[PDB]
Write an enzyme that holds these catalytic residues in place. Structure first.
Site, PDB file in Angstrom:
ATOM      1  CB  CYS A 177      -0.932   0.000   1.211  1.00 39.78           C
ATOM      2  SG  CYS A 177      -2.112   1.356   1.246  1.00 39.78           S
ATOM      3  CB  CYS A 182       1.430   1.510   4.201  1.00 40.04           C
ATOM      4  SG  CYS A 182      -0.294   1.127   4.551  1.00 40.04           S
TER       5      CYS A 182
END
EC number: 1.8.-.-
Lengths: 114, 91, 789, 32, 49
Positions: free
Chosen positions: A37, A40
């Site tokens: 992600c 992230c």
């Protein structure tokens, strides 16, 4: 000795149940990142900075939703980057935040809501 | 003279030693004398060609500032710095 | 894989390998030592090898002029007789010099770096001499062995110019009979018609397709048989010749392998020192284990002679933060070039580069970066193109330029195996620091590298407006900035020290720099605390952004001379400190400056601010380069750097342009530059910055006249670096005597220094027992006057 | 401008350890 | 081979094959009657030109 490069500690879901059931002196921040992600990458750096800034005054940990996906779903996580702030007082409701919240909002929550 | 050789000194020392040993074996009291004659020949030949390795002196001993472009010079002029000229012209 | 490696990592991983195995490997070869009477025996118990840390820290060793070194101890058995005549004392074997983390060894107080050596790789190679098919084994000791065919096979192995033997005779001497040859070669009736180290073993197995186990580290006779069989293959044409000069056939010896070799020498000296001291013990009795029959001299003086004398151990070029890095990544054929940014020395001494792998549907790879040497990467279709092409067909069939074998070719993406994704992959550190490098003639890429390696650190260093993004990597890996060693909150900051507290533990970090952290800052482990000399904000900062015009002034910028404003002297802009005591060296006439594009020049003139050309905003330009240099050295990239630097000065933006941005889009660099010029114009309301009639140029005015120069001048704020700073030759003799100006020639060759050198000439010939005799004949009297010689 | 590089950012290698610290950590060099 | 066959033996010896030139010329007792430039600059002369 060489000092470890990262402070935010990865937990399994069971090690997290242990850490939430046991008594806590300090706020527990749980990050439900996942390694594919994009946001992230940024959240992991914000949380590393938070984990330095609070030293032992906060317990900041992370849970990879590649591994603990059903636990993330049971935590009512609906996306990543998501973060739980769990009070050391077990009566209070925990705070879930969604998206890249500012590091100042993390400080606000930890100082004023936990 | 030593002032012209202040590696070849080892060769001169070797020749001197071999020759003095050969004189001693000639005079102190024959195939060893011959052996020393051979080694003297080898030493001298090594020393000549060495001088041949020194022979090059014609190029090494007989033969052998940053510039700034200045429009304000004439085609026959150059600008010579104070700090250099005071050395060049000292005499 | 995922990121640009640490530049010193090649040294670091080499040194750790030397510690992780080279000590065991070299100590294991230390033999048992036996006395002359075959009654007393000594051995090192290598299993007890123990490096104790340096008792003196680096900053003390450099001050005291000492070597920063760890001490190797090993326990040593010595049976002085039968039974209990045994001691097994732990003995000091000696100092090994330790590497400091940025890749250097302090030796007798001076930082040294071990330059990498390039060698011909071990293995087997075939040369077509003049056809004379010539096989050659190279062992990793550098030992050759040669095989040859000139006609009708009859393969000779060659040992010397007067020594050749037929390979069946050699194999018979190696104990292999004609029946083994017949069984073990593909063309046995051709043979019958005649009637290395781990790297070497690998490369001979690979090149001959053999399957000898790796434990057969030495050459086997069957290796020579296979070499002759492949040589018959070459004779028929069932193979290929090998090009020795190609980079695929080279290996790199790092600090690891040279230090390990020097440990081998040091232990062979230790062997002679033990044998000789055991001699003294077996003739004078003396004392058992005085420490032991070992002195510290062999290792200590072996390593210190290696560093003092070996051509591949060189004083660290501490000139600026870039050269401290680049020096440790040199690659020398002696005992040159430099390693590419992403290059890695593989486990077999090959130089490996990362390539993205396009495995399509079948496989479930985890990491899709391969590392491949130039030996492997020719057997893959490497593309450098982009997937940004579409047609009424499909992306898979869209063709791109690729590389396969040594050829360049055009192939469909369906055929491509690997992609060279990283921009910097093929560049050295110096080349990677050049923006718009794809717009500069590659001939000058070396020169423009060298220029940055000559740049003096400046007082009040300044970040470049335009860069490539490697100034960060260079600053980080140079070790000139104080990187934090431990996370924590800052406690204190001054010119002398930084203080951290974290994990409830304090750390004090003295500065040998200026603090970038505020006293209230909080720091993660490896973040910057303080900038060094010629860094700002943790970017390399070798130069200053000088407002510049390119126009031919009245000759004072003739052929890359440069004019500067007096403001460059006012502002300390190019003031350096040189230490001997220090001197505040200002910029002067005759100083050398360069841009990063190889646009070097020498300051010829310093003009007061009001004599300079000045822009339509009234600002005088601070230098005037000459534009004839731009097509002379073919560097259009600096004009981009000029224009976009101006944009960056007006927008308050820095730019970090990775090379080959034209891969996105044609004219991509022109589009970036003109876009940011137009933004700087319309934001600042400076319409002269982007004049649409001739973008990037503007009309500018003579400060001595106020009239505009009638054609637009290219203007910029490029990043300019200040660079660091009698034989009478035979061709001068030829020139002087060509002028017939022979009295000057006489002066230059005689009394300015028969002539005494002719006296030397005659004396040395006279010492060869030749009389060089000089006579002159009187014209009046015919008398043969002998000269004084 | 005046941006300071976060060498802990996602486009830098992990901080290189001190060579002595690393050798000690790997129990390759000893203190006492 | 035009040099090393140029009569001024110093122009030969100071060019190439110096020991061979000198050996032959000394056995030949050769006279370099000093003329030409290369053989004059060694002797520190006024250059016969």
């Amino acid at each position: 000795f060489v000092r470890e490069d990262y402070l935010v500690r990865k937990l399994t879901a069971e090690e997290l149940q242990e850490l939430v059931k046991g008594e806590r002196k300090v706020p527990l921040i749980v990050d439900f990142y996942a390694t594919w992600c994009g946001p992230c990458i940024l959240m992991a750096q914000e949380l590393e900075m938070l984990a330095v800034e609070y030293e032992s005054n906060a317990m900041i940990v992370k849970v990879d939703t590649d591994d603990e996906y059903e636990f993330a779903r049971d935590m009512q996580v609906r996306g990543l980057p998501t973060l739980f702030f769990i009070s050391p007082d077990p009566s209070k409701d925990a705070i879930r935040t969604e998206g890249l919240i500012p590091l100042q909002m993390m400080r606000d929550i930890i100082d004023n809501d936990m | 003279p030593p002032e012209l050789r202040p590696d070849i000194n080892e060769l001169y020392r070797r020749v001197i030693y071999r020759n003095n040993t050969l004189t001693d074996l000639l005079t102190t009291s024959g195939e060893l004398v011959m052996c020393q004659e051979k080694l003297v020949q080898e030493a001298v030949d090594t020393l000549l060609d060495s001088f041949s390795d020194v022979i090059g002196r014609f190029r090494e001993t007989l033969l052998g500032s940053v510039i700034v472009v200045g429009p304000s010079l004439s085609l026959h002029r150059c600008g010579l710095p104070r700090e250099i000229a005071i050395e060049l012209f000292q005499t | 894989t995922s990121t640009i490696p640490g530049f010193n990592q090649i040294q670091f991983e080499g040194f750790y390998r030397f510690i992780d195995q080279g000590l065991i490997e070299e100590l294991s070869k230390f033999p048992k030592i036996e006395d002359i009477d075959h009654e007393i025996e000594f051995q090192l118990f290598v299993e007890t090898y123990q490096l104790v840390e340096p008792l003196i820290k680096e900053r003390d060793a450099v001050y005291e002029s000492l070597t920063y070194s760890s001490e190797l101890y090993v326990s040593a058995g010595l049976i002085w007789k039968t039974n209990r005549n045994m001691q097994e004392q732990r003995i000091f074997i000696g100092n090994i010099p330790l590497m400091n983390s940025l890749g250097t060894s302090i030796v007798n107080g001076i930082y040294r770096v071990v330059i990498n050596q390039i060698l011909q790789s071990p293995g087997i190679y075939y040369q077509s001499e003049l056809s004379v098919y010539t096989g050659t084994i190279i062992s990793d000791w550098g030992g050759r062995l040669e095989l040859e065919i000139d006609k009708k096979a009859r393969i000779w192995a060659r040992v010397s110019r007067k020594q050749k033997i037929s390979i069946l005779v050699l194999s018979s001497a190696m104990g292999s009979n004609l029946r083994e040859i017949l069984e073990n070669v593909c063309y046995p009736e051709i043979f019958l018609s005649f009637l290395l180290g781990r790297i070497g073993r690998r490369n001979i197995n690979w090149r001959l397709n053999l399957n000898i186990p790796q434990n057969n580290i030495f050459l086997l006779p069957r290796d020579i048989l296979a070499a002759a069989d492949h040589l018959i293959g070459m004779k028929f044409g069932m193979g290929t010749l090998d090009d020795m000069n190609h980079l695929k056939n080279k290996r790199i010896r790092s600090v690891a392998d040279l230090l390990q070799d020097q440990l081998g020498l040091a232990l062979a000296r230790l062997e002679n020192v033990v044998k000789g001291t055991i001699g003294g013990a077996i003739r004078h009795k003396l004392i058992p284990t005085p420490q032991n029959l070992v002195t510290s001299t062999p290792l200590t003086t072996t390593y210190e002679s290696f560093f003092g004398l070996h051509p591949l151990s060189q004083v660290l070029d501490r000139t600026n933060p870039l050269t401290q890095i680049v020096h440790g990544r040199k690659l020398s054929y002696l005992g040159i070039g430099s390693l590419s940014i992403h290059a890695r020395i593989g486990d077999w001494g090959s130089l490996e580069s990362p390539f993205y792998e396009l495995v399509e549907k079948s496989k479930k790879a985890q990491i899709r970066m391969l590392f491949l040497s130039p030996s492997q990467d020719e057997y893959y279709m490497i593309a450098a193109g982009n997937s940004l092409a579409l047609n009424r067909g499909i992306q898979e069939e869209q063709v791109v330029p690729a590389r396969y074998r040594q050829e360049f070719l055009t192939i469909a993406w369906e055929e491509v195996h690997l992609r060279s994704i990283f921009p910097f992959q093929y560049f050295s550190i110096g080349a990677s620091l050049i923006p718009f490098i794809e717009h500069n003639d590659a001939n000058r890429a070396l020169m423009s590298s060298n220029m940055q390696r000559q740049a003096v650190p400046l007082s009040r260093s300044e970040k470049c407006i335009v860069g490539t993004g490697l100034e960060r990597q260079v600053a980080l890996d140079s070790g000139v900035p104080a990187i934090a060693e431990h996370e924590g909150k800052i406690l204190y900051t001054d010119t002398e020290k930084i203080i951290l507290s974290g994990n409830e533990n304090t750390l004090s970090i003295p500065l040998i720099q200026k603090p970038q952290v505020r006293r209230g800052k909080c720091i993660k482990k490896g973040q910057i605390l303080a900038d060094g000399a010629a860094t700002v904000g943790g970017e390399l900062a070798l130069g200053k952004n000088i407002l510049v015009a390119y126009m031919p002034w009245e000759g004072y910028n003739f052929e890359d001379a440069v004019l500067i404003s007096e403001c460059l002297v006012y502002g300390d802009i190019y003031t350096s400190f040189h230490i001997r005591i220090s001197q505040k060296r200002e910029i002067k006439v005759g100083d050398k400056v360069a841009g990063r594009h190889g646009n070097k020049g020498i300051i010829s003139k310093i003009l007061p601010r009001q004599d300079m050309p000045y822009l339509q905003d009234g600002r005088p330009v601070d230098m005037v380069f000459n534009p004839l240099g731009v097509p002379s050295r073919m560097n259009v990239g600096q004009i981009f750097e000029c224009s976009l630097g101006l944009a960056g000065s007006l927008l308050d933006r820095h730019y970090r342009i990775a090379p080959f941005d034209e891969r996105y889009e044609q004219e991509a660099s022109r589009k970036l530059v003109f876009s940011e010029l137009y933004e700087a114009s319309k934001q600042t309301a400076n319409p002269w910055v982007f004049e649409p009639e001739y973008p990037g140029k503007s009309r500018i005015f003579d400060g001595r006249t106020g009239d505009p120069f009638e054609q637009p001048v290219i203007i910029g704020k490029p990043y300019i670096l200040k660079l660091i700073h009698q034989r009478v030759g035979e061709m001068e003799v030829w020139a002087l005597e060509g002028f017939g100006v022979a009295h000057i020639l006489q002066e230059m060759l005689t009394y300015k220094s028969a002539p005494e050198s002719f006296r030397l000439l005659v004396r040395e010939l006279r010492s060869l027992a030749l009389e060089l005799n000089h006579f002159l004949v009187s014209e009046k009297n015919f008398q043969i006057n002998r000269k004084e010689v | 401008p005046d941006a300071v590089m976060d060498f802990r950012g996602p486009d830098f290698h992990e901080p290189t350890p001190n060579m002595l610290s690393y050798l000690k950590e790997n129990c390759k060099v000893i203190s006492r | 081979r035009a040099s090393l066959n140029t009569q001024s033996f110093i122009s030969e010896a100071s060019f190439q094959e110096t020991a061979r030139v000198l050996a032959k010329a000394a056995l030949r007792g050769r006279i370099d009657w000093l003329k030409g430039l290369k053989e004059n600059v060694v002797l520190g002369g006024v250059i016969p030109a």
